[PDB]
Swiss-Prot record, chain H:
This is NAD(P)H-quinone oxidoreductase subunit 1, chloroplastic. The chain holds residues 263 to 311 of 362 of the full protein. NDH is composed of at least 16 different subunits, 5 of which are encoded in the nucleus. It is found in: Plastid, Chloroplast thylakoid membrane. It comes from Hordeum vulgare. Belongs to the complex I subunit 1 family.
């Protein structure tokens, strides 16, 4: 139902997750919250070299 | 010791493999099986002749037996008779069926005088508010979905309704 | 305005979309910027629709098992919604969602003709019924009878 | 130091709050919080008649889906002796021994999804699909609601029902051994489930437990023998038990019992006085006048059904056992149509009494395995 | 002589937006509706068939319904099973603790009114909308396993009925009031020990 | 802890939260704050809520002698759920009137 | 340099024209009765002709198409 | 997941080698004309599979 098959479903979930009002809980903040997944994503992105 | 370990380290791995590869080649016929599960929403299941859906109301079959409350689990509908002088049976003016507060008991279907309370089977209750459920006499009929009367339906019978094997 | 090609002139039409709705909301989005304001109804449930669009009709509330006659005598939803509407408004865009198949009163095609006069005499109503994969529209008055 | 395991309760049987201490990874003491699903039936049960009260039972009972109506019909029909024919009794036996399956599936499937069997979740639902058609075509919408009236049952099950077991009736037989060869395979299945939450028989009877979870310690306290329930005992059977009582013993005793279900069903369909329903259908047209048919035997209803019937002082108890556990409805025999006081005795309320004493010095994973194997559900607990 | 009339539309609602700035949010909400994820919750007499919605009888996962067992992640929750007075004071926390594009609905006729729990009992809550604002009310006890998919299809259009200016109707204010107490405290009763 | 009757449009918070964020969700629970219907089921002009704010002392000081238990929280919420019903049954307050679902907990309007 | 366009144009257009509308037919024709390795056939191609497979993926446009003048 | 799969195949299997050695795909024909894009797409092909 995401077209013929889910060929657009994946990027559809991506775009949905894009907005989703990031919440940033109280205890702990941008000091380490936004810093967390950056290391995760870079650790595997740089490996593509 | 270690000689017992040097003999059993292959045994543990060979048991692990004899189980893993066996389950793998067994579920091989499952990952590429030839069953077809439930189709799209345009392929609803078959319905035999005993169920309960949207109950129906009448004006020539509810003789004012009035058992309406004495059947539903919470004595749901109203009872209203308003000073008739035809013989002794006061009329049927005020009534409102509300499936939001009826739990499909409707048991009067079995004890009603002349086939008044009956059954159907649809469900497109686009309820945008609770207070929009006044089901009076005839539009309850509406000639419902009629699974066989639709031009986009070919329903094969399920396990207990198809043939054997 | 492809909808505008068949709403302002006709004021009587029915939407024949695929049975998923995932392609029709864009059409409704465009009709909030002329003077058309939404009224979704899901017509199933009401009696003779005249007294549901012109008259003070007692809508019997969902009863609570007890309390013989108790009906709050609900009002209609045309002139009051006009009173809430600004003097700058083209038409009342209304959707009869439960117009279909493919003491109540069956909302038959005669009742839709009688709901096709309030657009003309004294609401821009559009009937609803699922249909072919391509989103189509068709004047329901000619389908009516 | 202590956190709750979540009222959201990422588990099978609904909402369970588990407040537990946590020393980093291992736990020291856990506690359950119950009472969040109060159906309050003990109140309404006095302010109602029987037939208006009939569909109420399979409401807090949707896992068992049938083990609530046995006692709920014992009080109206079995107490005042409105003689239930043996043919309708055999029909009710078919019902009960199919509800045994209705419980075996809706535990083992989710038990498979708790122990570690990740794939077979949808498998057991695909197997169960046929019971849906059966319960629908028999008496009611989906849970077969209102299959028990007072003077018998609602209506004799249709013809395409009884003689038509054969499909699933021989399918599931060859299907059982699938789970038995899968469980002993990949000992990671078995390693995590063995040697956890072990219980003995003396405490199983001292704590008041019941069901196969107790039978798994050589106790064999299976109450499908001790009661002349509707004179069912003409059939033959085989007691299912084990000799450990732990989680793996629970799995063994709850996989070795469902093989008897279709056995009793085969006993019935050919041993029922009417046999199949199409048989009795084609037989009541050649001997319409008079025969054993429609007599004290071969009759669905004995007397008129109606919400009017008086009672004397007779407060009878039945300990009717379900494959989840026992059940009882005691009630002060009152002179009025509806009685003074109602009471229920569910297995879930008599199961978690050991729950905080089960998970001792274990880990969160151990708690997960024990709570998935214990065969527990809400609905029955709160009532 | 109307009782409890509706407030007047304060704005004239007169504006016009560019297509190159509108179709963006249009397709964005299209994805937001065509990629919804369930949130696990189920208690009582109107829940069990939800499980069958994952198998070969009903399969709502065919549309990408990823069942998430966490409030902060998912956006679609089904208040299946009849709710009582309790388990509600922690239920609403779920609705409070998820992103704003929730658009929650109901399920179970015993959750829109409390059908088979509505004679006299101090446990069941009369409907769910007196606890949480939801959109669609689903009948049936048990709810028809197909009607839920039809109501999902129904709600699938409301999101498609949204525009770029509609992404401001989820912003909040604070009617935070300054009022104190004078009473005595009560120590914790749910003591976790055996 | 913060065990409050957080029913729709009735959230008698047993803990101090009248910042944008309480910074602990309780602020040690020493003020017993309250927020009114964040879902905007009713639009508020100050004067209309002034009677509710005045009778808040009638409910927190005039008839309170029991410890900090949700018993008192229901004792408050009961009359709180009917003060609004009275204020609407005489037409002084009205419903949401926004682009939400526009649900009717008390049903549609009437003709008196 | 003159007649170079027909060769590099025809093959590059076929590289993205015929496979996109037919992969959806070969997958809709068999989805539950396939063999152990049959799903391996068209799935790999799902990348190769991808220059056009996405152009007939759900991206397939339903613009209003201003009609003939 | 992707990097692990790619590394295990580029290490324990022939990276962009056919089932017949990679150099041998040229010698048995005595001449090549336009093997550039062919070998590029076939390296994406025989490796990603």
């Amino acid at each position: 139902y995401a077209g013929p098959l889910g060929l657009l479903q994946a990027i559809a979930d991506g775009t949905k997750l894009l907005f989703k009002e990031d919440i940033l809980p109280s205890r702990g903040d941008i000091s380490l919250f936004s810093i967390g997944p950056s290391i995760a994503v870079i650790s595997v992105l740089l490996s593509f070299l | 010791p270690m000689v017992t370990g040097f003999m059993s380290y292959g045994q543990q791995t060979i048991r692990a493999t004899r189980y893993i590869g066996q389950s793998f080649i067994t579920t091989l016929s499952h990952t590429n099986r030839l069953p077809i599960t439930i189709h799209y929403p345009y392929e609803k299941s078959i319905t035999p002749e005993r169920f309960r859906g949207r109950i129906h109301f009448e004006f020539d079959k509810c003789i004012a037996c009035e058992v309406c409350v004495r059947v539903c689990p919470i004595d749901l509908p109203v009872v209203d008779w308003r000073f008739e002088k035809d013989i002794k049976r006061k009329q049927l003016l005020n009534y409102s069926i509300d499936f939001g507060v009826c739990i499909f008991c409707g048991n009067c279907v079995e004890y009603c005088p002349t086939s008044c309370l009956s059954m159907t089977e649809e469900y497109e209750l686009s309820t945008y508010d609770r207070h929009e459920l006044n089901y009076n006499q005839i539009a309850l009929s509406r000639l419902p979905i009629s699974i066989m009367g639709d031009y986009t339906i070919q329903t094969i019978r399920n396990s207990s309704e198809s043939k054997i094997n | 305005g492809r909808w505008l090609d068949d709403v302002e002139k006709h004021k009587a039409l029915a939407i024949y979309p695929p049975h998923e709705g995932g392609y029709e909301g864009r059409y409704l989005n465009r009709l909030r910027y002329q003077g058309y304001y939404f009224l979704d109804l899901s017509a199933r449930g009401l009696g003779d629709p005249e007294s549901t669009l012109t008259k003070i009709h007692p809508v019997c509330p969902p009863s609570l098992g007890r309390q013989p006659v108790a009906r709050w005598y609900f009002p209609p939803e045309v002139d009051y919604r006009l009173s809430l509407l600004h003097p700058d408004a083209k038409g009342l865009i209304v959707w009869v969602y439960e117009a279909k198949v493919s003491r109540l009163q069956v909302l038959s095609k005669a009742e839709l003709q009688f709901l096709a006069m309030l657009p003309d005499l004294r609401v821009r109503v559009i009937a609803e019924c699922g249909n072919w994969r391509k989103f189509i529209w068709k004047p329901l008055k000619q389908i009516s009878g | 130091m202590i956190v709750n395991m979540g009222p959201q309760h990422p588990s099978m049987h609904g909402v369970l709050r588990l407040i537990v201490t946590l020393d980093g990874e291992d736990v020291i003491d856990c506690e359950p919080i119950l009472g969040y699903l109060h159906r309050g039936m003990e109140k309404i049960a006095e302010n109602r008649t029987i037939i208006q009260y009939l569909p109420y039972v399979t409401r807090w009972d949707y896992l068992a889906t049938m083990f609530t109506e046995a006692i709920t019909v014992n009080a109206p029909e079995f107490l005042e002796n409105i003689q239930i024919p043996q043919r309708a009794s055999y029909i009710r036996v078919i019902m009960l021994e199919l509800s045994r399956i209705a419980s075996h599936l809706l535990w083992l499937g989710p038990f498979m999804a708790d122990l570690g069997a990740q794939t077979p979740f949808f498998y057991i639902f695909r197997e169960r699909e046929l019971i849906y058609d059966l319960f629908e075509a028999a008496t009611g919408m989906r849970m077969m609601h209102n299959y028990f009236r007072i003077g018998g049952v609602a209506a004799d099950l249709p013809y395409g029902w009884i003689d038509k077991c054969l499909d699933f009736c021989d399918y599931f037989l060859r299907g059982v051994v699938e789970y038995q060869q899968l469980i002993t395979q990949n000992p990671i299945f078995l390693e995590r489930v063995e040697g956890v939450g072990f219980i003995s028989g003396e405490e199983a009877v001292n704590w008041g437990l019941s069901g196969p979870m107790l039978r798994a310690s050589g106790i064999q306290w299976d109450l499908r023998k001790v009661d002349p329930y509707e004179s069912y005992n003409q059939f033959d059977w085989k007691v299912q038990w084990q000799k450990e009582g732990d989680s793996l013993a629970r799995y063994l005793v709850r996989v070795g019992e469902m093989s008897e279900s279709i056995k009793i069903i085969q006993q019935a369909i050919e041993k029922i006085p009417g046999g199949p329903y199409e048989n009795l259908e084609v037989r009541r047209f050649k001997k319409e006048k008079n025969s054993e048919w429609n007599d004290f035997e071969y009759k669905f209803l004995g007397k008129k059904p109606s919400p009017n019937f008086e009672l004397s002082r007779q407060e009878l108890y039945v300990r009717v056992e379900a494959p989840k556990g026992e059940l009882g409805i005691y009630l002060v025999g009152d002179d009025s149509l509806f009685p003074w006081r109602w009471k229920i005795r569910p297995p879930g309320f008599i199961n978690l009494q050991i729950l905080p004493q089960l998970v001792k010095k274990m880990k969160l994973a151990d708690i997960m395995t024990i709570l998935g194997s214990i065969d527990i559900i809400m609905g029955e607990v709160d009532r | 002589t109307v009782m409890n009339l509706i407030e007047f539309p304060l704005l004239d609602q007169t504006s016009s937006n560019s297509v190159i700035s509108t179709t963006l949010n249009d397709l964005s909400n299209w994805s937001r509706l065509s990629s919804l994820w369930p949130l696990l919750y189920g208690t009582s007499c109107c829940f069990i068939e939800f499980a069958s919605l994952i198998g070969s009888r009903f399969d709502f996962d065919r549309y990408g319904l990823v069942p998430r067992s966490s409030p902060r992640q998912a956006d679609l929750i089904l208040t299946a099973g009849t709710v009582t007075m309790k388990m509600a004071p922690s239920l609403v926390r779920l609705y409070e603790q998820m992103p704003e594009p929730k658009y929650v609905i109901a399920m179970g006729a015993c959750t829109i009114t409390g059908g088979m729990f509505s004679t006299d009992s101090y446990s069941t809550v009369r409907g769910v909308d007196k606890l949480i604002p939801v959109d669609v009310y689903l009948p049936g006890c048990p709810p028809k396993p197909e009607a839920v998919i039809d109501a999902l299809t129904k709600l699938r259009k409301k999101i498609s009925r949204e525009i770029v200016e509609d992404r401001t109707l989820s912003q909040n204010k604070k009617r935070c009031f300054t009022t104190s107490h004078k009473l005595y405290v009560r120590r914790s009763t749910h003591t976790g020990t055996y | 802890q913060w065990l409050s009757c957080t029913t729709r449009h009735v959230r008698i918070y047993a803990a101090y939260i009248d910042p944008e964020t309480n910074a602990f969700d309780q602020t040690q629970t020493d003020k017993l704050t309250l927020m009114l219907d964040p879902t905007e089921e009713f639009v508020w002009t100050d004067e209309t809520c002034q009677m509710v704010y005045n009778e808040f002392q009638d409910l927190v000081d005039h008839y309170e002698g029991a410890p900090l238990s949700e018993y008192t929280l229901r004792l408050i919420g009961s009359d709180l759920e009917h003060y609004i019903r009275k204020l609407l049954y005489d037409g002084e307050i009205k419903y949401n009137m926004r682009s939400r679902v526009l649900n009717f907990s008390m049903g549609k309007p009437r003709v008196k | 340099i003159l007649g170079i366009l027909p060769p590099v144009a025809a093959i590059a257009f076929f590289y993205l024209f015929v496979a996109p509308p037919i992969i959806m037919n070969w997958m809709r024709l068999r989805w539950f009765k396939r063999k152990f390795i049959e799903t391996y056939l068209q799935f790999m191609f799902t990348y190769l002709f991808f220059p056009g497979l996405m152009l007939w993926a759900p991206f397939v446009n339903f613009r209003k198409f201003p009609r003939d003048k | 997941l992707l990097v692990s799969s790619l590394f295990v195949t580029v290490l324990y299997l022939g990276g962009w080698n056919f089932s017949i050695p990679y150099i041998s795909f040229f010698d048995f024909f005595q001449m090549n004309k336009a093997v550039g894009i062919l070998e590029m797409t076939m390296g994406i092909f025989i490796t990603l599979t």
